[PDB]
Design a protein around this ligand. Structure first.
Ligand SMILES: Nc1ncnc2c1ncn2[C@@H]1O[C@H](COP(=O)(O)OP(=O)(O)O)[C@@H](O)[C@H]1O
Ligand SMILES: Nc1ncnc2c1ncn2[C@@H]1O[C@H](COP(=O)(O)OP(=O)(O)O)[C@@H](O)[C@H]1O
Lengths: 557, 569
């Protein structure tokens, strides 16, 4: 892969050294099974006690060395992992402050939580666990096979009989059920979705039942029948595969292969001891290679997932409150326009609304004013300057937006209004709060304006939205972007949110996403989007007199 | 583990007993097949190799029995895996409809989804892959110890005593490795909490021109905290290294004692070699178990999930307008009283409303009369018949609901609405169609009622989906009808359909509503204002509105909010 290799560039050398040291340790831990062979050789030769003392002390030195290295290498690999994961976390930190804002708005992809928290830990287990375990599991069986071949190739070659049978049966099984294995993960996902619908749609099944209750049971029975029809016709295959790998069958095969050789005098008897020591577990070690390679693959998945985040494009910068939009067209993904060739212009201090039930990129069109994404074609200009050329120090003091799902920063509520202007005084913050009609709840909160806020807080959605409106009031941005969904987001707070929005919009240029048709009568220019493009434009009264799509939609409402 | 036994079907007891017997027989035809090496290699390396044939004969004559009994254990394992998969899947799918809805905290729902979905291949290969190797590699050391205690008693006692040492080393190694993984996860998650704090608050920072100071602060914090990640290596150091070192230390100890006995004259050289071979075989199953650990861990997780869903609390059990009564009913979810001091006695065939702040416990009332959750305290009755004591199949024809989330099971409009009473004639379907006003969408929809209106079939807006729900609830012959509140102002025809449901209902049945906006608070007979689960008000519509109570202020606020237009006051 290119992404995983690109991410793990600086760890090319430490991983190679860790692999070499794991190979060394694994070869050391298969040394005493050679020293026992030499011990048997000496006993057959009748060597003196001092030579056996030498061998028995070498077999303690080696198993001390292989336990000192395997804690004095995976102690070094741990701090190497720390020194790389720190430079990856501190790199993703810089990348978060340069991605387009709409990337953070979830496109249905992996969450912000998982895509860093789970993947950095999986990369930790790639570096410190998966690669060392994998090189150990790859170098153990090959070293064993080479040892058994150099000891006695004639007995070692017989070990391929169970291996050949196992591979032949696996090949016979996989080809005989190609359609089933192709269908298997898709069926798993389908029944996962069915379980999701059953669980989420529980009350209808509980209170109405009928078709809904029996649909899950029928689909589950179909899944179980699929599994049974797939696995049940291969019992004779699978059990025969399981037998030939076992240590007992290897033991019997080795003995039946060597005892005729030994008794006939065709091989020195002590050459059979390595096979009894190691070759009896040869089968159950090859079965462990797959687990290690699976661990490596699972780690590389997280490596690629973090790498893709670091490779997305950045928010580039090039080069009285008037807003100008000229022939803008935007696509979330290529070949899928959502806005196409629209055109608009807003006078200073005016208001504009986008209406339509089909969407037609109304939220997308509003978000493109604050450049949540760059327009694929056309341009947007604020006070004559193209928005591409305004850095965040100027852009978002020119354009202070408030969309749905306002996000609250951790800290004092007085600070939480003053992110756009931390130098604001207490009286200024209080006036902004009362303009936003949020002073009441803050006074109700136990510590007043000193009270802390954050992810864990008692403020509701409407209260947080009014807090964000107060923040935007302190920002003092002439151009704005707004979503009317914040109006009816909380019906209880709809009055206060309405007053706050009216206060914010009064002296400032605003562009609005409009859903409810009855909430826009005095706006200076109502707009309607359908088929991802402009269809009609005009005021509320003029559009009603025209008898166009707006009139039909209002009559429907 | 007890649960793995409890998952067995009751019919296969004569299969599980045979499995256990043939598993012990498999163990005692390879454990004896291992100890039989001693007569074999004690002749192979000795002055008389030709004696090997006899003991080789009785080694192959037990390996063949091992093959046959292993096949009969494995085929029986396939059968038991299939018949425990089917049994537990059906037991779960039967349990879940009867599970109380208080259980579906969304970690519980996530685990239930995992148990239902991901456990297909795994349960089919539980005994075949996990348990048979586990038992066959666990009993073999003790079996060899016993068979080498009856023969050559000074050594089998040492082997059986050292089984404790080796299993203790394995258990300690696994425990320390698991704790090491836990600590590594904790430390990694602690370091990067600031990055998630950044990502969540990215919009509010970037629009505030504060993104670079916050980025610098988080970078400084990460650099400051980075240096303290080394000191807690004390538990990963004795990881797999502990088990490997203990195994090889035991190996060399037994080999050294064998050589010491050889020099001391209590054993011959071929016997001392075959003893070493058997004392290597005595260790191999421990390595097999150690290799087998991760499968056991994952299966322990899945069995924990299946146990959790299986033992979830389940409801007990056992045509005019009924009378609905709450006898001082209370209910609690999470760590709060979602229903406090709830009691009433609805006169039959009336229209009633419920109002209050969202999250106050309003829909939970409908859940209680619906029978979705048993009452923690008090009694819930239908014509005096307690819903818990109602018969199971009869309870499903006692109530109807229109939910705040208009759930649709991915059928057509006709198919979705027909839920509740599939036997209704087409004219009744048309009448409910007219009453719910969804026919107005059939003027918009391409294929009429036959159009699929699933989540992927049609992007049906919340008001329109709720209208379909009104049609569905109106169709069935429920003696009790219930309605919830998700009527967004985008669809005023939805409010009109709700109004017709209150007023133009043909059938006689008690009607209860839960309402926020004006159209759904108008024509009821009484209101139960809810606040934090406590019914703070109870009275007529006019009585509460004219008295200037909480409901009056709520109605005034809603009406004033609905009257606003953008661009001026
Ligand atoms: N989270 C998202 N994932 C994928 N596509 C999206 C997402 N949000 C918007 N879109 C795209 O925008 C479209 C419609 O415009 P949108 O602004 O979503 O309308 P609305 O404002 O009514 O939701 C669709 O064509 C869709 O491809
Ligand atoms: N399955 C559930 N998961 C989480 N919370 C629940 C669940 N069921 C009920 N609740 C709790 O019940 C309260 C909502 O009850 P209620 O007011 O009747 O519904 P709504 O808020 O939609 O009107 C919430 O505070 C919520 O925490």
């Amino acid at each position: 892969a290119e992404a995983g290799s690109r991410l793990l560039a600086p760890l090319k050398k430490p991983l190679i050294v860790s692999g070499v040291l794991q190979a060394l340790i694994t070869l050391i831990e298969l040394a005493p099974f050679v020293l026992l062979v030499e011990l048997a050789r000496l006993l057959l030769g009748g060597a003196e006690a001092e030579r056996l003392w030498t061998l028995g002390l070498t077999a303690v030195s080696l198993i001390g060395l292989g336990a000192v290295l395997a804690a004095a290498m995976t102690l070094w690999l741990h701090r190497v992992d720390a020194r790389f994961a720190h430079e990856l976390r501190g790199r993703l930190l810089t990348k978060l402050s340069r991605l387009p804002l709409g990337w953070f708005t979830r496109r249905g992809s992996a969450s912000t939580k998982q895509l860093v928290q789970d993947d950095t830990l999986a990369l930790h287990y790639l570096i410190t666990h998966a690669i060392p375990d994998a090189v150990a599991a790859v170098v153990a069986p090959v070293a064993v096979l080479v040892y058994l071949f150099v000891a006695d190739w004639r007995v070692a070659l017989v070990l391929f009989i169970p291996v050949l049978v196992y591979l032949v049966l696996m090949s016979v099984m996989t080809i005989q059920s190609g359609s089933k294995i192709a269908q298997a993960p898709r069926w798993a996902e389908r029944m996962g979705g069915e379980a999701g619908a059953f669980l989420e749609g529980q009350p209808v099944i509980r209170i109405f039942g009928g078709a809904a209750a029996s649909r899950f049971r029928r689909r589950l029975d179909d899944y179980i029948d699929f599994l049974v029809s797939w696995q049940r016709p291969f019992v004779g295959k699978k059990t025969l595969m399981d037998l030939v790998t076992r240590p007992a069958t290897f033991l019997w095969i080795i003995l039946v292969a060597g005892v005729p050789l030994v008794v006939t005098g065709r091989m020195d008897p002590v050459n059979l001891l390595p096979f009894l020591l190691l070759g009896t577990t040869f089968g159950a070690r090859l079965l462990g290679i797959g687990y290690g390679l699976s661990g490596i693959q699972t780690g590389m998945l997280a490596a690629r997932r973090i790498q893709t985040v670091l490779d997305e494009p950045e928010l580039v910068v090039r080069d009285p409150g008037t807003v100008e939009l000229d022939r803008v067209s935007f696509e979330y993904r290529p070949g899928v326009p959502v806005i196409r060739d629209v055109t608009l212009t807003l006078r200073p201090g005016t208001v504009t609304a986008l209406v339509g039930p089909s969407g037609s990129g109304k939220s997308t069109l509003a978000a493109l004013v604050a450049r949540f994404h760059d327009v694929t074609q056309g341009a947007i200009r604020v006070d004559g300057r193209d928005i591409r050329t305004l850095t965040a120090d100027e852009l978002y003091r020119r354009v202070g937006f408030v969309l749905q799902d306002a996000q609250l920063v951790h800290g004092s509520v007085a600070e939480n209004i003053a992110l756009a202007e931390p130098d604001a005084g207490l009286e200024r913050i209080r006036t902004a709060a009362r303009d936003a009609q949020i002073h009441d709840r803050i006074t109700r909160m136990p510590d007043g304006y000193d009270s802390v806020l954050g992810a864990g807080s008692a403020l509701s959605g409407g209260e947080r939205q009014r807090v964000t409106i107060a923040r935007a009031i302190l920002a003092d941005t002439p151009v704005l972007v707004l979503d009317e969904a914040t109006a009816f987001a909380d019906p209880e707070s709809e009055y206060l949110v309405q007053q706050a929005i009216n206060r914010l919009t009064r002296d400032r240029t605003v562009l609005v996403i409009a859903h409810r048709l009855h909430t826009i009568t005095h706006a200076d220019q109502i707009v309607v989007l359908d088929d991802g493009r402009i269809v009609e434009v005009g005021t509320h009264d003029e559009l009603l007199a025209a008898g166009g799509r707006y009139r039909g939609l209002w009559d429907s409402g | 583990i007890r649960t793995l036994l409890r998952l067995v079907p009751a019919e296969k007891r004569g299969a599980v007993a045979g499995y256990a017997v043939l598993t012990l027989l498999s163990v005692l035809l390879r454990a004896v097949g291992a100890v039989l090496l001693i007569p074999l290699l004690a002749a192979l390396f000795s002055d008389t190799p030709s004696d090997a044939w006899l003991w080789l004969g009785w080694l192959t004559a037990v390996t063949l029995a091992g093959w046959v009994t292993d096949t009969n254990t494995a085929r029986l394992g396939f059968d038991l895996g299939f018949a425990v998969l089917s049994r537990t899947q059906h037991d779960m799918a039967d349990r879940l409809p009867n599970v109380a809805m208080s259980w579906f905290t969304p970690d519980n729902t996530a685990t239930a989804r995992q148990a239902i979905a991901a456990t297909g291949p795994e349960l089919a290969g539980l005994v075949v892959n996990l348990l048979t190797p586990l038992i066959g590699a666990a009993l073999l050391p003790a079996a060899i110890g016993v068979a080498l205690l009856f023969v050559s008693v000074p050594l089998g006692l040492a082997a059986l005593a050292g089984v404790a040492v080796l299993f203790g080393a394995l258990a300690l190694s696994g425990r320390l490795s698991r704790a090491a993984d836990k600590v590594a996860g904790e430390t990694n998650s602690a370091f990067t909490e600031r990055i998630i704090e950044f990502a969540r608050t990215q919009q509010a920072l970037r629009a505030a021109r504060r993104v670079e100071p916050a980025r610098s602060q988080v970078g400084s914090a990460l650099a400051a905290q980075h240096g303290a990640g080394l000191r807690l290596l004390t538990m990963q150091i004795p990881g797999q290294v502990l088990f490997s070192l203990a195994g090889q230390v035991a190996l060399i100890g037994f080999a050294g004692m064998a050589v010491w006995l050889t020099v001391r004259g209590q054993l011959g050289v071929p016997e001392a070699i075959a003893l070493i071979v058997v004392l290597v075989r005595y260790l191999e199953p421990f390595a097999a178990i150690a290799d087998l650990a991760p499968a056991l861990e994952t299966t322990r997780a899945t069995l924990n999930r299946i146990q959790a869903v299986l033992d979830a609390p389940t409801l007990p059990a056992g045509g005019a307008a009924p009378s609905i009564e709450f006898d001082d009913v209370r209910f609690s979810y999470g760590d709060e009283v979602v229903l406090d001091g709830v009691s009433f006695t609805l006169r039959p065939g009336n229209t009633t409303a419920i109002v209050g702040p969202s999250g106050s416990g309003k829909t939970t009332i409908l859940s209680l009369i619906a029978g979705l959750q048993q009452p923690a305290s008090g009694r819930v009755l239908l014509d005096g018949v307690d819903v818990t004591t109602l018969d199971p199949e009869a309870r499903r024809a006692a109530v109807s609901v229109v939910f705040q989330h208009p759930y649709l099971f991915d059928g057509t409009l006709r198919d979705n609405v027909l839920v509740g009473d599939p036997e209704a004639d087409p004219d009744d379907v048309t009448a409910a169609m007219r009453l719910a006003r969804v026919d107005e969408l059939l003027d918009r929809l391409p294929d009429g009622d036959a159009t699929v209106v699933g989540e992927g079939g049609t992007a049906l807006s919340g008001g329109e989906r709720q209208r379909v729900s009104i049609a569905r609830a109106l169709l069935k012959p429920a003696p009790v009808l219930l309605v919830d509140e998700a009527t967004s102002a985008l669809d005023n025809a939805n409010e009109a359909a709700v109004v017709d449901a209150l007023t133009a209902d043909p059938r006689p049945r008690t009607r209860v509503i839960v309402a926020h906006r004006l159209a759904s608070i108008r024509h009821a007979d009484r209101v139960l204002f809810v606040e934090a689960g406590r019914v703070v008000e109870d009275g007529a519509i006019d009585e509460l509105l004219a008295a200037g109570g909480r409901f009056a202020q709520f109605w005034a606020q809603q009406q004033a909010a609905s009257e606003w237009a953008i661009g001026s006051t």
